[PDB]
């Protein structure tokens, strides 16, 4: 079809199971994009449903702080999901470089992340894979806007109806209800937000172990703490929002809407 004719591939930005992400240029327009190239030669019925679901979810979400799908092009043996190019790299890189954010910078960051997650949930989308590697910066100038990316594991949910949608996500960011193999929905994203906000304030995660079984035990038990010295200067209201996000029971866990109204975000 029309990707081969209009677009030109350049360097790899990353690679997946049967997909690669490459910078491309829509030639006649002189505009650059990020092209997710999925290989479609002998895909299962399941794998086709997942591709159409990612495409559908990505078409659904129009928000300042969500990566925009430009186009979805079906060619023989290759599918192209074409997204606005985000040039400031992953949130992950920025945290490591700066070591941690100030509460002001951390608050502005998680505010934009929560406004993105709120929009997802209002549209019946659960990401399941929130982490600093899936948040991109609009530019390399400090205080640039963050953009939620990579909806490959995102699911569609019918209102607040939730269930066992299978084991998916990233170990350190997985919610307790996913590890217990219990019904789950929108709250798994707010648990991940809890992990991200903890990382933003002191520059390391609340759950870590070389042994994955032990990491999962710590997560299921909500066995995190706020050690000296890096927590010594942190406000209790910052610790409060983290606590309300890192709540084991998804019923009593703070929502995106509720978190956006937390004094630490709003009176600021």
């Amino acid at each position: 079809t029309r990707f081969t004719e209009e677009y030109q591939l350049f360097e790899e930005l990353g690679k997946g199971a049967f997909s690669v992400v490459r910078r491309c240029v829509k030639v006649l327009a002189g505009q650059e994009y990020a092209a997710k190239i999925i290989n479609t030669k002998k895909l299962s019925a399941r794998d086709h449903q997942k591709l159409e679901r990612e495409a559908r979810i990505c078409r659904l979400l129009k928000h300042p702080n969500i990566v925009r799908l430009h186009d979805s092009i079906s060619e023989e043996g290759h599918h192209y999901l074409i997204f606005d190019l985000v040039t400031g790299g992953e949130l992950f890189e920025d945290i490591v470089a700066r070591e941690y954010y100030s509460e002001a910078d951390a608050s502005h960051c998680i505010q934009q992340i929560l406004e993105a997650v709120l929009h997802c949930h209002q549209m019946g989308v659960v990401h399941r894979n929130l982490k600093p590697e899936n948040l991109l910066l609009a530019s390399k100038l400090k205080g640039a806007a963050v953009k939620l990316a990579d909806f490959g594991l995102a699911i569609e949910v019918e209102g607040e109806q939730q269930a066992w949608f299978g084991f998916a996500g990233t170990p350190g960011y997985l919610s307790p209800e996913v590890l217990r193999k219990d019904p789950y929905g929108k709250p798994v994203d707010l648990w991940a937000c809890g992990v991200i906000l903890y990382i933003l304030l002191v520059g390391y995660p609340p759950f870590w172990d070389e042994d994955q079984h032990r990491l999962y035990k710590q997560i299921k038990a909500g066995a995190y703490d706020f050690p000296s010295p890096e927590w010594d200067t942190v406000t209790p209201e910052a610790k409060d929002l983290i606590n309300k996000m890192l709540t084991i029971n998804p019923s009593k866990r703070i929502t995106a809407a509720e978190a956006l109204k937390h004094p630490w975000i709003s009176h600021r």
């Binding site: 590697e133 299978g166 996500g169 990233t170 520059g203």
Partner: peptide
């Protein structure tokens, strides 16, 4: 001590 490291996604149990 806890460290900030890159982590790959899962699609099933490992």
């Amino acid at each position: 001590r806890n460290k900030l490291r890159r982590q790959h996604s899962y699609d099933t149990f490992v």
